[PDB]
Amino acid sequence: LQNIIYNPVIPFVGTIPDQLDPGTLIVIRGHVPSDADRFQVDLQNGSSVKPRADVAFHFNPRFKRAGCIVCNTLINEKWGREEITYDTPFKREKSFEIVIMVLKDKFQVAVNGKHTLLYGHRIGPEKIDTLGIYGKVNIHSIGFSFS
Ligand SMILES: [Cl-]
Ligand code: NA
């Protein structure tokens, strides 16, 4: 992998060092603490907080009850229609690997080597230049494979 970041402080906000062209991978390895409620991986158009940077792809594992993953997009500080996946591989106290693959029409995400979900583009992926990781999660490494 390319442009690897080790043991970042959370919240992490970093510039993605090349374009997210089809076939590009974002690989995030970490673990979920025992008290986690949720965490998220946000692919953003910049890092502004005011107005808040648009979020092309919000990938949001939630741990209450049986758990799920919520995905959405934030445009001009308004969330769109949530996409929910109930078949969640994440668990408190367990390590994980997330691989986000950028495709022409969508993202595809695999967790722990297994296909997890698709998310159709709502913002042009060319507008994504920033990776945010927030919430109750421990990140070991972030790396990229650019196409
Ligand atoms: Cl948020
Ligand atoms: Na945020």
In sign, the C-alpha dihedral spanning 89, 93, 97, 98 is: positive
Give the closest ligand to the alpha carbon of residue 60. Answer: 1
- The domain made up of 1-147 has a fold known as Jelly Rolls (2.60.120)
What's the farthest any 2 CA atoms get from each other in the chain?
39
Q: Give this entry's resolution in angstroms.
A: 1.6
138 annotated to a ligand binding site = no
d(CA 98, CA 100): 6
What are the distances in angstroms from CA 138 to CA 17, 75, 85?
A: 22, 27, 22
Provide the experimental method for this PDB entry: X-ray
Which ligand is closest to the CA of 133, given by its number? 2
**C-alpha dist (Å) from residue 5 to 2, 16, 34, 93:** 9, 11, 24, 22
Determine the distance separating the centroid of ligand 1 and the alpha carbon of 33, expressed in angstroms: 19
d(CA 139, CA 53): 22
